[PDB]
Design a protein around this motif. Structure first.
Motif, mmCIF file in Angstrom:
data_model
loop_
_atom_site.group_PDB
_atom_site.id
_atom_site.type_symbol
_atom_site.label_atom_id
_atom_site.label_comp_id
_atom_site.label_asym_id
_atom_site.label_seq_id
_atom_site.Cartn_x
_atom_site.Cartn_y
_atom_site.Cartn_z
ATOM 1 N N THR A 67 13.882 -6.566 8.215
ATOM 2 C CA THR A 67 13.851 -6.255 6.782
ATOM 3 C C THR A 67 12.776 -5.039 6.585
ATOM 4 O OG1 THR A 67 13.816 -7.302 4.477
ATOM 5 C CG2 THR A 67 11.951 -8.103 6.163
ATOM 6 N N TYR A 68 11.529 -5.145 7.460
ATOM 7 C CA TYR A 68 10.559 -4.526 7.344
ATOM 8 C C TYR A 68 10.768 -3.098 7.782
ATOM 9 C CZ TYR A 68 7.015 -8.295 6.518
ATOM 10 O OH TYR A 68 6.429 -9.306 5.995
ATOM 11 N N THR A 69 11.520 -2.777 8.974
ATOM 12 C CA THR A 69 11.833 -1.581 9.478
ATOM 13 C C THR A 69 12.662 -0.531 8.335
ATOM 14 O OG1 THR A 69 13.891 -1.272 10.960
ATOM 15 C CG2 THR A 69 12.497 -3.020 11.321
ATOM 16 N N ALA A 70 13.634 -1.169 7.663
ATOM 17 C CA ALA A 70 14.217 -0.523 6.643
ATOM 18 C C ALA A 70 13.275 -0.354 5.507
ATOM 19 C CB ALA A 70 15.371 -1.740 6.085
ATOM 20 N N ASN A 71 12.261 -0.828 5.284
ATOM 21 C CA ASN A 71 10.996 -0.525 4.438
ATOM 22 C C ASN A 71 10.361 0.590 5.014
ATOM 23 O OD1 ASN A 71 10.835 -2.789 2.328
ATOM 24 N ND2 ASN A 71 10.286 -4.044 3.958
ATOM 25 N N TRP A 72 10.183 0.644 6.228
ATOM 26 C CA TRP A 72 9.224 1.657 7.032
ATOM 27 C C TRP A 72 10.090 3.080 6.722
ATOM 28 C CZ3 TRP A 72 11.745 4.516 11.049
ATOM 29 C CH2 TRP A 72 10.839 5.550 11.595
ATOM 30 N N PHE A 73 11.325 3.139 7.072
ATOM 31 C CA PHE A 73 12.295 4.332 6.910
ATOM 32 C C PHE A 73 11.928 4.788 5.505
ATOM 33 C CE2 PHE A 73 16.206 6.414 6.085
ATOM 34 C CZ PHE A 73 16.259 7.140 7.175
ATOM 35 N N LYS A 74 11.878 4.044 4.298
ATOM 36 C CA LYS A 74 11.670 4.446 2.958
ATOM 37 C C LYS A 74 10.381 4.867 2.780
ATOM 38 C CE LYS A 74 14.510 5.758 1.024
ATOM 39 N NZ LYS A 74 15.530 5.721 2.068
ATOM 40 N N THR A 75 9.550 5.381 3.910
ATOM 41 C CA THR A 75 8.293 6.005 3.986
ATOM 42 C C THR A 75 8.525 7.411 4.455
ATOM 43 O OG1 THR A 75 7.354 5.194 5.763
ATOM 44 C CG2 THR A 75 7.187 3.568 3.788
ATOM 45 N N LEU A 76 9.642 7.803 5.088
ATOM 46 C CA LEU A 76 9.787 8.878 5.650
ATOM 47 C C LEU A 76 10.011 9.753 4.620
ATOM 48 C CD1 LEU A 76 11.044 8.905 9.140
ATOM 49 C CD2 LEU A 76 9.056 7.787 8.101
ATOM 50 N N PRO A 77 9.542 10.976 4.592
ATOM 51 C CA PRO A 77 9.133 11.732 5.768
ATOM 52 C C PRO A 77 7.441 11.808 5.933
ATOM 53 C CG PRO A 77 9.728 13.380 4.178
ATOM 54 C CD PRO A 77 9.778 12.077 3.764
ATOM 55 N N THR A 78 7.178 11.928 7.189
ATOM 56 C CA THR A 78 5.880 12.220 7.361
ATOM 57 C C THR A 78 5.547 13.689 7.884
ATOM 58 O OG1 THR A 78 5.552 9.923 8.695
ATOM 59 C CG2 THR A 78 3.778 11.393 8.359
ATOM 60 N N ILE A 79 4.556 14.336 6.833
ATOM 61 C CA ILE A 79 4.450 15.699 6.668
ATOM 62 C C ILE A 79 3.112 16.045 6.699
ATOM 63 C CG2 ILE A 79 6.545 16.318 5.807
ATOM 64 C CD1 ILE A 79 5.368 16.272 2.863
ATOM 65 N N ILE A 97 0.886 -1.336 -0.035
ATOM 66 C CA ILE A 97 0.097 0.020 -0.092
ATOM 67 C C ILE A 97 0.644 1.217 -0.081
ATOM 68 C CG2 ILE A 97 -1.870 1.189 1.167
ATOM 69 C CD1 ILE A 97 -2.651 -1.336 2.544
ATOM 70 N N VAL A 98 1.988 1.201 0.741
ATOM 71 C CA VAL A 98 3.121 2.263 0.619
ATOM 72 C C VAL A 98 3.613 2.580 -0.939
ATOM 73 C CG1 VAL A 98 5.370 2.128 1.133
ATOM 74 C CG2 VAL A 98 3.919 3.028 2.775
ATOM 75 N N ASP A 99 3.688 1.482 -1.800
ATOM 76 C CA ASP A 99 3.857 1.821 -3.076
ATOM 77 C C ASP A 99 2.605 1.683 -4.211
ATOM 78 O OD1 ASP A 99 6.738 2.039 -3.051
ATOM 79 O OD2 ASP A 99 6.785 0.115 -1.909
#
Length: 1025
Positions: A937-949, A908-910
């Protein structure tokens, strides 16, 4: 009738003709004496109407009969006597009666036809015969009866009724023709659509019979027919498709024929324009409509200053409209109205075809018309015209200096109108062309009218212009306006003050420069005419806000003394300029206003306590009550009422001021809270006849409380009383728009009052309300034709907010009540309509925030996981928030759904990183961060969804999580993600970041903020440790 009864009644009814005394004495005698006597009375009146040789007694009785026969009502009358009345009415109808009396008889007869009354086949028979009579009044009166009792049209055989109308439309007598058209259209407005197909086929015959009016030169009757046609367009516009061009050409033909009096021309215009408001797709799908409409309106806008080429009469008058220029006025209203409904997509092309031509005419009137037309069409065609903006200016601006002053006026108008519609972009784009054009018209080279209108157009421009943009033009503007301020003509001065005021308001701090020069000019005007002084006081206080308190304090004392003088001296137009000014002074003065309250509040209390000023009224007694601009009459449940609209509007304005004084003064307003709350706000919710009042009542409530709270038990009593009336209002409120305000009101009340502010029976009553509201919304949305072509989302949005507010104040315990309306909530969850779904999902997210939901886990996670991958990003948002909140507050009871769906969240993030779904994917981002906290592996994905604005609650968590992922070479993305969040004002995380930068060389550290411009580096310095 018994012989005595006759002369008793005959005397009384004769007393009705006359003096007040004899006529009132009779009125009393009838209303006191005449349920034992009703049927005698009815019998008498009907006989009089039928047989009396005296015109006036006959008419009167017929009228009386009609009135009393509704009131009776006719249903409850003895069959034996109904029959006699019916027969004498019918006998009178068919006898020799004056035309006016047959009309009255007809209307009495109509009162004796009712679905549940015994059948009256004699009437049908007498109508069928009468329609064939060679006496026009028989034919006219028959259609009239069919107008009052359209169901009679169903009772006649179709092969008799169809020829009846075709003969009707065609009749020798104009009177008969109009009555047939009225009856025909009346049919559609009184019968259900299932019945329409049955007369529909006649429309052709009607339309075809139209040119005959013009042949006979009977255009005044044509106008009446156009009016009935206009009603039919509102009812069944599709019916005219495919005879469309024939009416279009015909209206075109009529409007063009300009030695017709205007009535037939303006109603023909209306017919044309009304199609666009009732069948836009139809109008769009015909090239000919837009073309004729534009052509025809341009012709009409030409009809100004007739027999007066110089416009002498116009230059000398004031800037109000000459409402004697009727066809011109109608034409621009028309062009505007059509443009609005059809858009520029459809009419730019034809419009411009004609503009190009008239702009260059040697007839001034045509050059004028072109300006006025663009000006009328501008809002509507905004969509296309916002991008042909220099093209517009190129055509318009040459005329700014036209030989003829009215063309000049015209040119000013477009410039003004355009400035508004195409704002804010036109301010940024065309200042260099617009401002000089307008400013040049301020000079005394030009005529009063033009100067004033150019000044008007400058207000339009200024409203949306930056201080920065205006700055270079101010000195020029100001010097010119001051000349006009000295004008000789009231209206030029008035407009000059208003233009100055509104420029000043735009200019803000850049107006400080001009304060010293202007203010005493202003004071002198004040010391010397109501509108002038009020416009002057307005200008003064608008300037005062623009410059701020300190600067305004140079004259404020004197200003205030003048205000007081003005307030307490012997037009209600002034009252408003005063009110707005006092209020503006309070925004300037802050708490220093407090000593002034006893001057200012008492008149506002009086106005804001006006009662629901209502007159329980009678049928005829309405149309004359309707004459007043200040009044409107409506029907509640058949029985009518006159409501003093102006007064109620005034109450709202007063309430608005009380509300802003309370908002600015906070604690200081506390003295008034009890009186306003009990005598104004609360009683205002029972104003079922005016929703503005109801709404203003509600919005006042939480602001009142907040005021008392800031000063200091009574608060509790008031809050109980208020919240209770709001809650009870939720069930009785008919308008959904108002319902929303009540919920919003409660939310804000709850936020003011804090913890546990609501009693158990209150909570239960709120739930019935919420249930009734959700029930009424469902029923409205299960709505969505052969003849025809956000308020719900907003309401539900608020109900979500009130439920969350109530849960929070009760700290969970509202979950108990919340179980009762789960059926409702469930239906919503699995309906189709995305609106009801989003609602349910959001409720659900609130429930979980307060592991006691397992009861339901198995009931809604199926749907939530569906929703996760919905096409709709608002749905994905709601769903992912649910999943996020599950792992946060209910960690062990939801571990099984949360971790599976974790993959879905990476997907969903992509168009994820767009603006439209930046919202949705930000929630998903936070949802996965929540799960990673509760349980690499998941948390490295999470980071690629920053930043939150964009989402505040989401952002809140992600950076709290980012701060934990650290305290327990992505460094420039780490820092940036943070800088972006603060800079975008979405969300100590800084402390964690610092520590990271601690483990780096001074030079490595510094290179991270190589990217950033000055303005955000100013902020960065002030964010770091």
């Amino acid at each position: 009738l018994p012989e005595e009864v006759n002369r008793t009644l005959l005397q009384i009814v004769q007393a009705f003709a006359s003096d007040n005394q004899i006529r009132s004495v009779a009125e009393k005698a009838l209303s006191e004496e005449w349920e034992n006597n009703i049927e005698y009375l009815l019998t008498f009146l009907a006989e009089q109407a039928a047989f009396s040789q005296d015109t006036t007694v006959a008419a009167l009785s017929a009228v009386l009969f009609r009135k009393l026969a509704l009131k009776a009502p006719i249903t409850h009358i003895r069959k034996e006597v109904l029959a006699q009345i019916r027969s004498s009415l019918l006998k009178g109808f068919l006898s020799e009666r004056a035309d006016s009396i047959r009309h009255k008889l007809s209307d009495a007869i109509a009162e004796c036809v009712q679905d549940d009354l015994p059948a009256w086949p004699e009437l049908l028979q007498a109508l069928i015969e009468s329609l064939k009579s060679g006496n026009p009044n028989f034919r006219e009166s028959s259609f009239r009866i069919l107008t009052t009792v359209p169901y009679l049209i169903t009772a006649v055989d179709i092969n008799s009724i169809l020829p009846i109308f075709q003969s009707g439309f065609t009749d020798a007598s104009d009177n008969v023709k109009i009555a047939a058209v009225t009856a025909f259209v009346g049919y559609f407005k009184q019968l259900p659509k299932s019945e329409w197909s049955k007369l529909g086929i006649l429309l052709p015959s009607l339309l075809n019979s139209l040119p005959r009016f013009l042949d006979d030169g009977k255009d005044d009757a044509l106008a009446s027919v156009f009016e009935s046609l206009i009603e039919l367009v509102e009812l069944a516009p599709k019916l005219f498709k495919d005879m469309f061009d024939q009416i279009i050409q015909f209206t075109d033909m009529v409007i063009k024929n300009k030695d017709l009096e205007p009535p037939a021309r303006t109603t023909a215009l209306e017919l044309l324009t009304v199609f666009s408001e009732n069948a836009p797709q139809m109008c769009k799908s015909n090239q000919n409509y837009g073309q004729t409409l534009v052509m025809v309106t341009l012709i009409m806008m030409t009809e100004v200053s007739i027999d007066d080429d110089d416009a002498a009469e116009w230059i000398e008058s004031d800037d109000t409209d000459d409402e004697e220029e009727v066809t011109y006025d109608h034409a621009r209203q028309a062009l505007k109205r059509v443009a609005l409904k059809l858009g520029g997509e459809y009419l730019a092309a034809p419009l411009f075809q004609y503009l190009q031509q008239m702009i260059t005419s040697t007839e001034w009137r045509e050059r004028f018309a072109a300006m006025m037309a663009l000006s009328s069409a501008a809002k509507g065609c905004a969509d296309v015209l916002i991008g042909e903006i220099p093209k517009i200016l190129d055509m318009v601006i040459p005329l700014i200096n036209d030989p003829h002053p009215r063309v000049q006026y015209g040119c000013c108008n477009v410039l003004g109108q355009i400035s508004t519609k195409f704002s804010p972009f036109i301010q940024r784009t065309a200042h260099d062309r617009i401002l000089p054009a307008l400013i040049s018209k301020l000079t005394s080279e030009c005529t009063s009218r033009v100067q004033t209108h150019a000044a008007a157009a400058l207000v339009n421009f200024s409203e949306f212009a930056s201080k920065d943009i205006l700055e270079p033009y101010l000195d020029s503007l100001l010097t010119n306006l001051l000349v006009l301020l000295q004008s000789n003509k009231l209206y030029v001065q008035e407009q000059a003050l208003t233009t100055i005021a509104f420029i000043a308001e735009a200019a803000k701090n850049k107006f400080i420069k001009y304060y010293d020069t202007l203010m005493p000019l202003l004071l002198n005007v004040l010391k010397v005419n109501s509108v002038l002084k009020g416009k002057c006081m307005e200008c003064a206080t608008l300037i005062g806000f623009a410059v701020g308190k300190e600067k305004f304090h140079e004259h404020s004392q004197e200003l205030i003394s003048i205000l007081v003088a003005l307030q307490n001296s012997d037009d209600d137009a002034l009252r408003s300029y005063l009110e707005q000014s006092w209020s503006r002074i309070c925004r300037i003065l802050g708490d220093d206003f407090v000593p002034l309250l006893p001057i200012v509040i008492p008149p506002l209390l009086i106005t804001a306590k006006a009662t629901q000023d209502v007159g329980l009224i009678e049928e005829e007694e309405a149309a004359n009550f309707q004459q007043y601009p200040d009044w409107d009459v409506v029907q509640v449940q058949g029985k009518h009422i006159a409501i003093h609209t102006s007064v109620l509007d005034d109450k709202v304005s007063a309430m608005e001021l009380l509300q802003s004084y309370a908002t600015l003064l906070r604690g200081q307003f506390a003295v008034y809270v009890k009186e306003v709350m009990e005598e104004i706000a609360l009683p205002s919710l029972d104003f079922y006849l005016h929703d503005g009042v109801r709404a203003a009542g509600a919005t006042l409530i939480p602001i009142l409380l907040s005021c008392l709270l800031a000063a200091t038990e009574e608060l509790v009593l008031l809050w109980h009383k208020a919240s209770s009336k709001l809650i009870g209002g939720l069930m009785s409120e008919p308008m959904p728009e108002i319902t929303q305000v009540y919920h919003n009101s409660l939310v804000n009340g709850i936020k003011v009052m804090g913890d546990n502010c609501l009693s158990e029976d209150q909570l239960a009553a709120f739930t019935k309300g919420v249930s009734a509201n959700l029930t009424d919304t469902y029923e409205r949305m299960q709505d969505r034709d052969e003849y025809n072509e956000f308020t719900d989302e907003d309401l539900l949005d608020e109900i979500n907010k009130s439920i969350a507010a109530v849960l929070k104040t009760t700290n969970g315990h509202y979950l108990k009540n919340l179980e009762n309306i789960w059926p409702m909530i469930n239906t919503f969850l699995l309906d189709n309509e995305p609106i009801l779904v989003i609602f349910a999902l959001v409720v659900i997210g609130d429930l979980i925030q307060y592991e006691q939901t397992a009861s339901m886990k198995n009931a809604f996670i199926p749907k939530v996981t569906e929703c996760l991958i919905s096409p709709d990003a608002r749905i994905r948002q709601a769903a992912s928030y649910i999943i996020g909140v599950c792992a946060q507050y209910a960690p062990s009871t939801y571990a099984d759904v949360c971790i599976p769906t974790l993959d879905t969240l990476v997907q969903i993030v992509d168009g994820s990183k767009l603006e439209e779904n930046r919202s949705s994917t930000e929630n998903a981002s936070a949802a996965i961060a929540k799960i990673l906290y509760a349980y690499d592996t998941y948390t490295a994905n999470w980071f690629k969804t920053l930043p939150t604005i964009t989402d505040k609650e989401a952002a809140s968590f992600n950076y709290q999580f980012l701060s934990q992922l650290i305290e327990n070479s992505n460094i420039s993305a780490v820092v940036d993600s943070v800088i972006q969040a603060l800079n975008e004002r979405s969300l100590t995380v800084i402390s964690s970041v610092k520590k990271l930068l601690g483990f780096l060389p001074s030079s490595d550290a510094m290179a991270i903020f190589n990217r950033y411009p000055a303005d955000i580096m100013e902020k960065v310095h002030k964010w770091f440790a």
